[PDB]
Amino acid sequence: ASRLYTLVLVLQPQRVLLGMKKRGFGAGRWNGFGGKVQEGETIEDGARRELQEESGLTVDALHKVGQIVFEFVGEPELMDVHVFCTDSIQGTPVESDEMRPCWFQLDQIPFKDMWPDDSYWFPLLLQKKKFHGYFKFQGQDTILDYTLREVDTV
Numbered sequence: 001a002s003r004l005y006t007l008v009l010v011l012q013p014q015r016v017l018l019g020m021k022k023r024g025f026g027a028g029r030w031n032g033f034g035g036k037v038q039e040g041e042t043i044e045d046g047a048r049r050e051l052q053e054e055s056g057l058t059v060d061a062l063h064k065v066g067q068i069v070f071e072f073v074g075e076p077e078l079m080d081v082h083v084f085c086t087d088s089i090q091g092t093p094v095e096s097d098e099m100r101p102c103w104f105q106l107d108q109i110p111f112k113d114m115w116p117d118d119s120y121w122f123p124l125l126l127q128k129k130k131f132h133g134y135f136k137f138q139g140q141d142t143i144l145d146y147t148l149r150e151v152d153t154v
């Protein structure tokens with residue numbers, strides 16, 4: 001049993017937009033934009049909504065790039081995270097209550113202040129490969145086990 005979440009990475013050939021999370025789950029970490037999917041909206045529409053909410057931005061098209069399932073020891077609900085990607089954005093990243101957006105060079109991606117799974121699956125993101133992931137967490141810092149597989153169909 002699982003719960004739907006979104007994750008949106010604005011990926012430009014020289015840079016990638018991340019946002020610093022100021023409160024709530026996983027605060028004090030750089031991350032993609034997104035959150036819970038609501039009843040009555042599609043997964044992609046939820047991904048867009050959260051992008052607009054957290055960074056101000058709107059996009060033409062969002063591309064499905066992966067799916068990562070997260071399991072936390074002691075929590076029965078799984079996180080079913082649908083990952084999206086886009087180069088073309090409309091507007092300017094501005095700050096919100098949830099996220100402080102900031103651009104990063106592709107050779108300065110701040111992995112040590114990101115969720116530790118990001119080390120594993122970013123290579124496939126940057127190479128424009130579609131993927132299915134699973135990561136079992138113990139607390140916020142410790143990956144007990146994982147799988148990561150390139151797929152053709154997300």
Ligand SMILES: O=c1[nH]c(=O)c2ccccc2[nH]1
Nearest residue numbers: 007026031032070115117118
């Ligand atoms: O890149 C990530 N973003 C997340 O929101 C996240 C949430 C829970 C576990 C890993 C995560 N990894």
